[PDB]
Amino acid sequence: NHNAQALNTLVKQLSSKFGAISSVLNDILSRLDPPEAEVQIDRLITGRL
Amino acid sequence: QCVNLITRTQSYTNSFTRGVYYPDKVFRSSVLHSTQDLFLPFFSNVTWFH
Amino acid sequence: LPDPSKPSKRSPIEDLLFNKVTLICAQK
Amino acid sequence: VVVLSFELLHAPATVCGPKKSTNLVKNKCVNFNFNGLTGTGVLTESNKKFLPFQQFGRDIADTTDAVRDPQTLEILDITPCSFGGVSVITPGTNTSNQV
Amino acid sequence: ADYSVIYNFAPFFAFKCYGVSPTKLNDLCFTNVYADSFVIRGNEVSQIA
Ligand SMILES: *[C@@H]1O[C@H](CO)[C@@H](O)[C@H](O)[C@H]1NC(C)=O
Numbered sequence: 001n002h003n004a005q006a007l008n009t010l011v012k013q014l015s016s017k018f019g020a021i022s023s024v025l026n027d028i029l030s031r032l033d034p035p036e037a038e039v040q041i042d043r044l045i046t047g048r049l
Numbered sequence: 050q051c052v053n054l055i056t057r058t059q060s061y062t063n064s065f066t067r068g069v070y071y072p073d074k075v076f077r078s079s080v081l082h083s084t085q086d087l088f089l090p091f092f093s094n095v096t097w098f099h
Numbered sequence: 100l101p102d103p104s105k106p107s108k109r110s111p112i113e114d115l116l117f118n119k120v121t122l123i124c125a126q127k
Numbered sequence: 128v129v130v131l132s133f134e135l136l137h138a139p140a141t142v143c144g145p146k147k148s149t150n151l152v153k154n155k156c157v158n159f160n161f162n163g164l165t166g167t168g169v170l171t172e173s174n175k176k177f178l179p180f181q182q183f184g185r186d187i188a189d190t191t192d193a194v195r196d197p198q199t200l201e202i203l204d205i206t207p208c209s210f211g212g213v214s215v216i217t218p219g220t221n222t223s224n225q226v
Numbered sequence: 227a228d229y230s231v232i233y234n235f236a237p238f239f240a241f242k243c244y245g246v247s248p249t250k251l252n253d254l255c256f257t258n259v260y261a262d263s264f265v266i267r268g269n270e271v272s273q274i275a
Contacts, residue, residue: 007126008122008126011125011126011188012188014188015188015189021245024137026164026165026166027135027137027163027164027165030163030165030250030253030254031135031245031246031247031250031254032246032247032250033247033249033250071178071180074178074180074181074182075181075182075183075184075185076175076177076178076181076183076184076185076193077184077185078175078184079187080187122187122188124186125186125187125188125190126188128263128264128265128266128271128274129261129262129263130261130262130274131259131260131261131262132258132259132260132261132262133245133246133256133258133259134256134257134258134259135245135246135254135256136257138257139255139257140255140256140257141256141257142227142255142256142257142259143227143254143255143256144227144228144251144252144253144254144255145227145228145252146252146253162255163253163254163255
């Protein structure tokens with residue numbers, strides 16, 4: 001149960017916005033300009049790290 | 050042609066667990082999903098009109 | 100002792116222990 | 128002053144850009160764009176009973192698993208293309224170079 | 227939605243966009259779209275934010 005629950009929590013952490021505008025990277029890439037897309041991906045990267 | 054022709058009586062009843070709808074238009078299967086929306090509370094203080 | 104009848108060659112107590120202990124694609 | 132208040136989601140929507148449409152494919156790892164949602168995967172047939180009002184499907188992990196095409200009302204399953212780790216089994220380089 | 231006609235009559239003083247990159251406005255699908263209109267003072271355009 002501990003192993004399964006830890007894996008489930010790690011998977012569920014992918015759905016968090018982490019202060020960005022969208023929790024999915026593709027929409028951020030296809031919706032914004034690189035100078036601000038870099039900031040959004042920075043927030044997502046630090047959260048997932 | 051406005052005429053008053055209806056007389057109404059009120060009773061109060063318990064709603065049990067009725068009044069649940071699909072919150073959105075996304076297909077889900079074999080899950081437990083938590084939503085915050087406008088729902089009729091369980092066992093409500095409901096009004097029967099006759 | 101091991102049970103030759105079972106294909107897994109496990110003792111009855113071992114079989115009981117195996118049976119008594121028990122989404123994957125999403126993680127994968 | 129004139130302000131425009133578009134609202135964006137993972138939704139089929141009604142207002143769309145002037146881009147042209149293209150025929151679909153099956154059983155092949157392709158990258159697709161459906162009404163603004165971009166994803167790479169394999170498109171397969173569906174046995175899921177999609178409700179008429181429903182458009183997409185999500186799994187336990189809240190990921191897009193099935194989608195209804197806007198131009199033709201059909202349900203298609205998204206399955207990400209095959210991937211996995213690679214390991215190299217080798218003896219000592221002193222002994223040989225085969226792997 | 228084609229925003230080229232928007233750039234047809236284009237003596238804009240300010241065309242800043244917040245959540246979407248203006249150059250990619252033709253690459254997305256939109257819903258619940260509203261267009262508002264009013265008139266203010268020249269120095270108050272910064273206040274619309
Ligand atoms: C139902 O509602 C009425 C009016 O709000 C209240 O007087 C009555 O006591 C309620 N019934 C119960 C069982 O609480």
